[PDB]
Amino acid sequence: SVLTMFRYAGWLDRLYMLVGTLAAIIHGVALPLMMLIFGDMTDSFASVGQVSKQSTQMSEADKRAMFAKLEEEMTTYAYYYTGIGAGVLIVAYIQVSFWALAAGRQIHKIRQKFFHAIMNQEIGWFDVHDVGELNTRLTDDVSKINEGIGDKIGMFFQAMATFFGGFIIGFTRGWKLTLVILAISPVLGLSAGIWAKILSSFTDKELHAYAKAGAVAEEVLAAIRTVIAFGGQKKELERYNNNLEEAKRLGIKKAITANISMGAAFLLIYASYALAFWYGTSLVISKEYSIGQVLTVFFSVCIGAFSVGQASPNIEAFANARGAAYEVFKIIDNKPSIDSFSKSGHKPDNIQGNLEFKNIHFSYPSRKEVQILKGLNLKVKSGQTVALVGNSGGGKSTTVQLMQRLYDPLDGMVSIDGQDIRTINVRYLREIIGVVSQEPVLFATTIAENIRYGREDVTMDEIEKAVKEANAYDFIMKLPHQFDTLVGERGAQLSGGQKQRIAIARALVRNPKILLLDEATSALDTESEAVVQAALDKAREGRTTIVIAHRLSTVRNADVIAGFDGGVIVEQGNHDELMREKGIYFKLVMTQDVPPASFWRILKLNSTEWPYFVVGIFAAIINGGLQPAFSVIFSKVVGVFTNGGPPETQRQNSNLFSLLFLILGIISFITFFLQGFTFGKAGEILTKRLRYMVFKSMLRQDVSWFDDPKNTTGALTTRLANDAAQVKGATGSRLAVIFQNIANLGTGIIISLIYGWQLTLLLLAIVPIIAIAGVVEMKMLSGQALKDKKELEGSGKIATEAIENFRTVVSLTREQKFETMYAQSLQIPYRNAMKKAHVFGITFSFTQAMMYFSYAAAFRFGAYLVTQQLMTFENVLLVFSAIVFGAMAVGQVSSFAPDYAKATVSASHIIRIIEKTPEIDSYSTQGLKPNMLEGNVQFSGVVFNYPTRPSIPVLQGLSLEVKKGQTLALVGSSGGGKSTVVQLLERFYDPMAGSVFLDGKEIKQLNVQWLRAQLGIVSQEPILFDRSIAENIAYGDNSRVVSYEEIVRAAKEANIHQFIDSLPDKYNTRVGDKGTQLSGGQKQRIAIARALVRQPHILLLDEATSALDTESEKVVQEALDKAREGRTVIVIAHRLSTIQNADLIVVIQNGKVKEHGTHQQLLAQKGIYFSMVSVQA
Ligand SMILES: CC(C)CCC[C@@H](C)[C@H]1CC[C@H]2[C@@H]3CC=C4C[C@@H](OC(=O)CCC(=O)O)CC[C@]4(C)[C@H]3CC[C@]12C
Ligand SMILES: CC(C)CCC[C@@H](C)[C@H]1CC[C@H]2[C@@H]3CC=C4C[C@@H](OC(=O)CCC(=O)O)CC[C@]4(C)[C@H]3CC[C@]12C
Ligand SMILES: CC(C)CCC[C@@H](C)[C@H]1CC[C@H]2[C@@H]3CC=C4C[C@@H](OC(=O)CCC(=O)O)CC[C@]4(C)[C@H]3CC[C@]12C
Ligand SMILES: CC(C)CCC[C@@H](C)[C@H]1CC[C@H]2[C@@H]3CC=C4C[C@@H](OC(=O)CCC(=O)O)CC[C@]4(C)[C@H]3CC[C@]12C
Ligand SMILES: CC(C)CCC[C@@H](C)[C@H]1CC[C@H]2[C@@H]3CC=C4C[C@@H](OC(=O)CCC(=O)O)CC[C@]4(C)[C@H]3CC[C@]12C
Ligand SMILES: *SC[C@@H]1NC(=O)c2csc(n2)[C@H](C)NC(=O)c2csc(n2)[C@H](C)NC(=O)c2csc1n2
Ligand SMILES: Nc1ncnc2c1ncn2[C@@H]1O[C@H](COP(=O)(O)OP(=O)(O)OP(=O)(O)O)[C@@H](O)[C@H]1O
Ligand SMILES: Nc1ncnc2c1ncn2[C@@H]1O[C@H](COP(=O)(O)OP(=O)(O)OP(=O)(O)O)[C@@H](O)[C@H]1O
Ligand SMILES: [Mg+2]
Ligand SMILES: [Mg+2]
Incomplete structure (x- = not known):
């Protein structure tokens, strides 16, 4: 169903939605109600109030009074504007705050129960679905649900209330004319519905693409060590870039559909205006209506029509939310067969282990x-x-x-x-x-x-x-x-x-x-x-x-x-x-912190697509200036309309204004589509570029950066997605309308100035007061933007930690504990959302109230102007319209302050990741690249301390030598530093003292990628990707395309070819996340094949036979011994069988060397090696 969301409403959220909808209805109809109750100057609201001369004999006493009575009417209307402004303050605060609160509570429950649906699935469910997408869902789809069930619904209801109120006023002054114009309501509604459905489908596809992109980033960042060892940064970025391109294409389609929806709505409205003048000119010729009659109904239907036209973004947000609520509720509704949360089942008191x-x-x-x-x-x-x-x-x-x-x-x-x-x-x-x-x-x-x-x-x-x-x-x-x-x-x-x-x-x-x-x-x-x-x-x-x-x-x-x-x-x-x-x-x-120009520089990164920007600016200027120019052109239109010469022929001959409204509709369609589409395409290109650059920067960083407790997989994945989305939220059509509004304000400044300059000071005064609410909200919200980003990083950390380790969580029965931790991590953003609800409600309330107070002040000041004969009544009505539009523009810009707030904090952070330079740069082309390599590896007094535990001495003056054709066997107890040697030879870290030499050249002078290119390592806990077996062995050389025969040869040398051949789909079989879908020995053998396909000059094995059988170990040992010469091999082993064949064995403990020599030499002395071999026997 469409309403699968709002399932977790509850009575309080239902009451919030109901009362907020009632407040929205009241706020929408309150402007129609003013003109319904008071209609003597509502006819005057049709500008150029026709005076029919009568100035030939103005007594200056008859004239005098008239102006005093008119002044009194304007003063009464100003008082009623003040009252309506107070009422609007209250009802608008209710309308925004209640809907925001309901949306926030519902989103909190939705997140909590979506987390308590991933933890409820079986291991078999996790073995079939790509769960690396799930966290992205928790970070993104729910957010897009939040953007479509809150303030937007109230705004849409307010626009609908304005629509119906305006049409009710017309029915009062002209039933037939209103009924004919109301004929566009069903076609406008069906247009909006079809465009919303297409938007929902495109949103679903785009979120699927974004989820795929997040999954790549989850796999690569959780395996950065393998990625850096094998130099796969380029490939992992291309993989991310593919899903980025798919998401960008889907977003471009989304922008096209949304803006053609907006343009179609405006075109339909303008065509309805021409139809309205057509039928009304008929009603006039046939003498069943007056000119006032057709003008009033028009002013009443126009306000509601334009309100509905402006309500389109709310429908777009609702469609996006309904598209985002698909996969989340699909996963929520899934009920596992093996329910770990079920209370049913026997719990025997005395479990004897039979x-x-x-x-x-x-x-x-x-x-x-x-x-x-x-x-x-x-x-x-x-x-x-x-x-x-x-x-x-x-x-x-x-x-x-x-x-x-x-x-x-x-x-x-x-x-x-x-x-x-x-x-x-x-x-x-x-x-x-x-x-x-x-x-x-x-x-x-x-x-x-x-x-x-x-x-x-x-x-x-x-x-x-x-x-x-x-x-x-x-x-x-x-x-x-x-x-x-x-x-x-x-x-x-x-x-x-x-x-x-x-x-x-x-x-x-x-x-x-x-x-x-x-x-x-x-x-x-x-x-x-x-x-x-x-x-x-x-x-x-x-x-x-x-x-x-x-x-x-x-x-x-x-x-x-x-x-x-x-x-x-x-x-x-x-x-x-x-x-x-x-x-x-x-x-x-x-067989034995925030610069204020960060958004400006992020947009400067969007400089390549400047023609889109200039086209969008021109279109926004055109429509924003046509918004107040509507009053002026209708003033001229009203002029001739009212003018009556010949009775019937010339009146019908004035069909040129129906054509004028048709042309206005075509121009509005074109300009709205162009503005929105150009800004949306620019935003899509910008967000794709920002994600690409941030992911590249993350892949550039050192291993020590990834060891930072703040830089976890979940935190990194949340940071990237959140910063990209937050910056995107202040760009695109959201930015476009802002420019339009400036144009609107500018036009309001000029139309007033050419018509009356005294009232322009009112705009110059009211802009500060309508923007002070925006700036104070921008302030309040800026700090909690940082706070919520920091807390959302921890929430994503918890979620990813639970997902990537779901088998351990299930075995430990810790799903409830992780759910509790996730709920706790959500509390601060939840409370910030609840207070932001009230803050935004107060801001919108104050803005609308000061708009109405500005109208009251305008009417009073115009009364003063008219009484002193300084300005005419037609002028004070045209400029008043300009003031209304200018106040709207300032108010909407102030409503953009929250979107820009998040964008600037996010920009100050995207700019910093991108400019961050690692100490061991893997992207640097600088560095000496030896033409020949002889496989001589030397450690001279190497002293190293891990950055996360810098006070613990790991290696103390470690010195060792290994040459081509020699096998170095590192032995010792756990934690002695055997793996640290391998990590240092890969230059994952740099030692403070001592040096590492390759063929007599110190390794910090060599090119990092070059140095890693001649290193082939099998890690202690080998990690594979959820990709094919053949794709996993091929990651052993990312510089070239590895052939099928080479992969098969590597598999045969690794004693894993027979299993792959016997298995259906052969080398195309996907292993799961981190080799979950294969046995430990098969995964380790595939890792060995990955290292061997490279044909490395330096082969570093870190317990490369721990999960292998005796027969498999024998086959791998024979394969390595066949290619013993021609390379240098360093092996870390806890098995003496592999060790005893090494050319030299060194016993490292506490970062030092105690015993070194051959197997017989170490066995002769009754040292640590002898103790180990004796305890083994
Ligand atoms: C076009 C967009 C911009 C606005 C759409 C407005 C209406 C079509 C929506 C907005 C809010 C909706 C309401 C929000 C919440 C609920 C509660 C909801 O309750 C449940 O689904 C309960 C399920 C359960 O308890 O298990 C029933 C529908 C209803 C009344 C919705 C009916 C349809 C409404 C009025
Ligand atoms: C009582 C007076 C004052 C106003 C009367 C207004 C109606 C004539 C209009 C208003 C909203 C319109 C509806 C708005 C949207 C749609 C959906 C549209 O179908 C779609 O676009 C998608 C259908 C789906 O998703 O199931 C079909 C017409 C319909 C029902 C419209 C039918 C005509 C409606 C009821
Ligand atoms: C009509 C005029 C007089 C304005 C009336 C304002 C009230 C309708 C507002 C002002 C204070 C608001 C309350 C301020 C804070 C909260 C806590 C908030 O709690 C949460 O959901 C978050 C905390 C949690 O449950 O963990 C729920 C809404 C509520 C009761 C608000 C409900 C609406 C209130 C009463
Ligand atoms: C939304 C607001 C904050 C923006 C700016 C509002 C002002 C432009 C409004 C607020 C109250 C208005 C005033 C309310 C009452 C008066 C007194 C009135 O005094 C007379 O009639 C004096 C006659 C004489 O002695 O000659 C003249 C208009 C004036 C100044 C109004 C001019 C317009 C004012 C200053
Ligand atoms: C930043 C904050 C402080 C701005 C607050 C704005 C309000 C305090 C202002 C804005 C518009 C003002 C109104 C604009 C015009 C009028 C008409 C004015 O009429 C007269 O002076 C009539 C005198 C007569 O003819 O006898 C009385 C004050 C009033 C209601 C003003 C009351 C104060 C209002 C609501
Ligand atoms: S109907 C033609 C034009 N109005 C709009 O374009 C328009 C878009 S949104 C909107 N009006 C909202 C719903 N209107 C107001 O908030 C409002 C308060 S007071 C007022 N408009 C005055 C009475 N409007 C005009 O004088 C006027 C002439 S043309 C026009 N609006
Ligand atoms: N990333 C790291 N950050 C901080 N300390 C680390 C890190 N990796 C290892 N250490 C610590 O450094 C020391 C040496 O660990 P290392 O992995 O080099 O030992 P090892 O000889 O390979 O051990 P084992 O035989 O158990 O595999 C240990 O005290 C270990 O806890
Ligand atoms: N999640 C999984 N999905 C699909 N196949 C799997 C999965 N886990 C294991 N397999 C396959 O099932 C078979 C047996 O795997 P299992 O882990 O039970 O073996 P094992 O005897 O424990 O091996 P080892 O000695 O290497 O640890 C292998 O062919 C393995 O690839
Ligand atoms: Mg180790
Ligand atoms: Mg096993």
């Missing part, structure tokens, strides 16, 4: 032609440990996901204590299960707050106990702020092992009955793995654990071990029995 998987058949929703499990059967007894082993992609993580009811199996049963889990309450089932995922993800908050996400009502003592069990106490105590040290998005400001241990503690603070641990020790060293294993063993008896580990040391002591082959368990049993059977387990085990 887990059964019976004939489990499952296929993922995104890839539903692939069978992952084919009659999986597995029984886990209370207090027992099952260890799931097998090849990568077999379905172990799928089984873990099915245990926590992330999906429902197509066939089979998952049961606890013999009870089917689809009948258990979803939330209750999930709280009794604690899960550590294959690649743990933290949240952008403190360590303690991250732990509290496992269980909200947790004390500091139990947090300490859990982090001691997780072997996390030591490093948390070591860095300052203790538990209050905030980590980055997804835990990026911690080492991989630290993040994994934090996740372990977060799962442990739940005291779960079912502990799922999927590769929970992949980022840990031998000591941390051993101590965490012992801590878990000390608590096994009370709970049941399902553990999946590619490190076969942990599964040695498991009570039962189950092997996956072909989607089923082929061998289940203990270690000794499986070794006796010599099955797949045996095979696995053997």
Whole structure:
């Protein structure tokens, strides 16, 4: 329906809308009512009040009185203008404030419930829809709903009230003439309706394009590190630019439709005027009407017609809001099958850990032609440990996901204590299960707050106990702020092992009955793995654990071990029995602040399209000056009309004025369309350019910039969209009409001046008082613009953090907590909106009241002028019309002050991002680019401290050397700085002391893009894009077009080609967001292929085999050994099997080197390396 919105009105918002509509009706009819009650000079309101001479014999006494009686009438009308002005003050304040309050409350509820619809969806829903658009929706569509259900509805109702009041006055003075002119009401209405429907469709398409553009920006900014490492800034900007172009085209179409609607309305009105004079000239010839009769009905219908003509932007805003309310309410109305918010379902008192998987058949929703499990059967007894082993992609993580009811199996049963889990309450089932995922993800908050996400009502003592069990106490105590040290998005400001241990503690603070641990020790060293294993063993008896580990040391002591082959368990049993059977387990085990000109400079960025601007200015001047010139030309029109010579022939011969009104309608159509279309196209080009430049500037910035807690994905994505939209809100047709109004005021100045100069001083006085309300509102609103921008950045941060990490939120049952945080983040903008409602209501009220007071003052001063014979009554009526139009112009400019307020704050910020220069500039062409590279990498006394934690020494005089054909093995404990070396070699940061040399040349002198071009890195937690497999390997070289054969060769070297070939759609298969749609090993192998397709001279691996099986690791090692010569390789490994083949191994701890040499040399001495290899054995 059209009215899907206003669903969350409630009684208070209904009462606001009803009383505001009543106030709008009263305010609209109050001007018709004045002329209805008082009509003796309403006939005079037809200018050139015909006196029919009578001045030949004016007694100067008969003349005298006449002027005194006329003065008395003007004074009475001035008093009534003052009274109507006070009434207008009250009713206009009510009309604006009530509608704004209702819109604000409804928008607050809409945002809250749209957030409580994304959190309610299933994981399968998230695996099919592009959820990277959703935040843009929350930032944009709702805002466009806010712009179409507030003040605009009241304004439209006021215009309608003026329309009906004017037509009621005509009916009183001429039923037939009014009925014929009213014949354009249905055609005008249908025109408005069709244009509104087209506007709604175009708005829906444009918002879809903007949502797609926001999704690219969400993916790229969340993966800026991969984007910078592989130099994909140009490609990621082209991807953004494509959706920017689509949105610009749709917006240009929107501008065309809206302005042709405006022009068509004005053309219809002017054609109706010509029809009115036609039929009235008939009524006069046939003698059934007088001239006064046709003039009055005209003045009465004209005001309402022009009010409706001016009401078109309100209809456009309503159409845009209804177009924006499509996807939001579509997502809201969607009801999941697995409802985590449902209260139904059994919550058994005594959950004994009896887990059964019976004939489990499952296929993922995104890839539903692939069978992952084919009659999986597995029984886990209370207090027992099952260890799931097998090849990568077999379905172990799928089984873990099915245990926590992330999906429902197509066939089979998952049961606890013999009870089917689809009948258990979803939330209750999930709280009794604690899960550590294959690649743990933290949240952008403190360590303690991250732990509290496992269980909200947790004390500091139990947090300490859990982090001691997780072997996390030591490093948390070591860095300052203790538990209050905030980590980055997804835990990026911690080492991989630290993040994994934090996740372990977060799962442990739940005291779960079912502990799922999927590769929970992949980022840990031998000591941390051993101590965490012992801590878990000390608590096994009370709970049941399902553990999946590619490190076969942990599964040695498991009570039962189950092997996956072909989607089923082929061998289940203990270690000794499986070794006796010599099955797949045996095979696995053997193979071992605000400048005020900011808007001016943003518009100066729009200088290329100056011809559009000049055409729009000319059109705005034409229509704005024709608005008051209407009174003058009708004065001349009235002149001849009233003049009667021959009775019938010449009166009908005066059809030239119907032609004049037709020409005026054509000119109005052309000028309104031109002005609006040119300004809207200029605004579309400007907003697209601003988004392009801001996104390019963000991709230019350093890694340290992205590590700033204020610069989070959600914050950045909100900042970009919000600044572009806020600047756009003060440009386009909104700007165009402003120029028109200036022209109007200018014309009002000249028409008065050529007709009477005494009344011009009244305009010169009343402009300041009608603009003081605007400037004081511009002030009040300017500071809360900054405040609301800062709060909306945090709201977007919370929303994006919840969306990008929805699986973690669902596993932790933290959807309600994130909803509470989102609601809290909305409170300050909500209260600011509620107070802005009253501020805008008072501003509009004061403006209209001073307009009416200006009319009263005009009538009184004109009475003085007429009494002293200084000026005539025809002149005081023409100029009074000029004063009315000038007051309108000043009032509308003052109403533009809120739009410009947001624009200037946003401009001062768009200008700054754009002019910001990073220290390590990746766009700079400067820098020495060596013609040859020999692969000699040296670190000399490198000292580095991370910008977000500058007081913690990370590397202290680190020195190392690696040459071509040599393999450097970085080993050591978690947090020692192994990944920091790789990040420094990529020049993500610059060390304060020491140097990094490439072939004897210090790396800060080399070109940054050139230096990164010869680096091929596999990261510790590899990130892929939601793009094809082939597109992901090809990101390994963005400079050239990578061929299909090269991609296939890289995949074969990465031992991933067979999976891609077997999978339907092959290399065109989309992986999901950050490799969600592939197993950890498959994702890591695709990352390896991405790094290898580049054929780098320097290959940096950061635990590149953590998620790989023994066979896959062997294949990758053989592939690397085949190409061992011809490049230099630096490997970070927690597995001694890969390390023992390295040419040289260095043990780095606390940023220093302790032991270095070959495997035999390190083994000879009983040092750290010997201790590690002995504890492993
Ligand atoms: C052309 C544009 C510029 C103005 C359109 C004016 C009317 C067509 C609209 C404006 C406000 C609307 C009203 C705003 C709110 C409501 C409450 C709404 O209530 C619900 O939808 C309740 C649903 C629920 O409780 O679940 C019913 C329609 C109604 C009366 C709407 C009827 C149609 C109205 C008068
Ligand atoms: C009682 C006197 C004083 C005024 C009478 C006015 C009517 C003759 C006019 C006013 C508004 C007009 C309506 C305004 C808009 C539309 C929608 C229009 O269809 C569309 O453009 C879209 C249809 C849709 O979206 O469903 C069809 C004509 C209609 C009903 C119009 C029919 C004629 C109406 C009722
Ligand atoms: C007719 C003349 C005499 C003017 C009458 C003015 C009233 C109609 C105004 C003035 C103060 C207004 C109130 C000022 C502030 C608020 C709080 C506001 O609360 C919110 O929705 C935000 C806070 C929250 O709920 O978190 C709701 C509207 C309300 C009651 C306003 C309702 C309309 C009021 C009573
Ligand atoms: C909307 C407002 C703030 C803009 C400016 C308003 C003035 C231009 C209005 C406000 C009150 C008006 C005055 C109200 C009453 C009088 C007294 C009146 O005095 C006489 O008749 C004097 C006769 C004599 O002694 O000769 C002359 C007009 C005047 C000054 C009016 C002139 C126009 C005034 C100054
Ligand atoms: C920035 C703020 C302070 C502006 C406030 C404006 C109002 C205080 C002014 C604007 C127009 C004024 C009115 C303009 C003209 C008249 C007619 C005037 O008539 C006479 O003086 C009649 C004398 C006679 O003939 O006996 C009486 C004051 C009055 C109502 C004025 C009352 C004060 C008003 C409402
Ligand atoms: S009807 C031709 C012309 N009026 C307009 O163009 C017009 C657009 S919007 C509008 N008038 C609003 C609804 N009018 C007023 O606010 C208003 C208050 S007093 C007044 N207009 C005086 C009586 N108008 C004129 O003298 C006049 C002559 S032509 C004209 N308006
Ligand atoms: N969300 C998903 N959508 C579609 N397919 C998926 C999804 N998640 C996993 N898959 C696919 O299901 C299969 C099994 O994946 P799963 O994560 O269960 O394997 P695994 O045994 O845990 O692997 P690994 O040892 O690499 O961690 C793979 O082919 C994988 O690509
Ligand atoms: N972006 C960052 N901001 C601040 N501190 C960081 C950041 N990244 C890492 N650190 C810190 O720097 C230290 C070294 O981390 P690093 O990632 O280099 O270790 P590592 O040897 O690779 O660890 P692991 O074996 O756990 O992967 C740790 O104390 C870590 O918390
Ligand atoms: Mg897995
Ligand atoms: Mg690391």
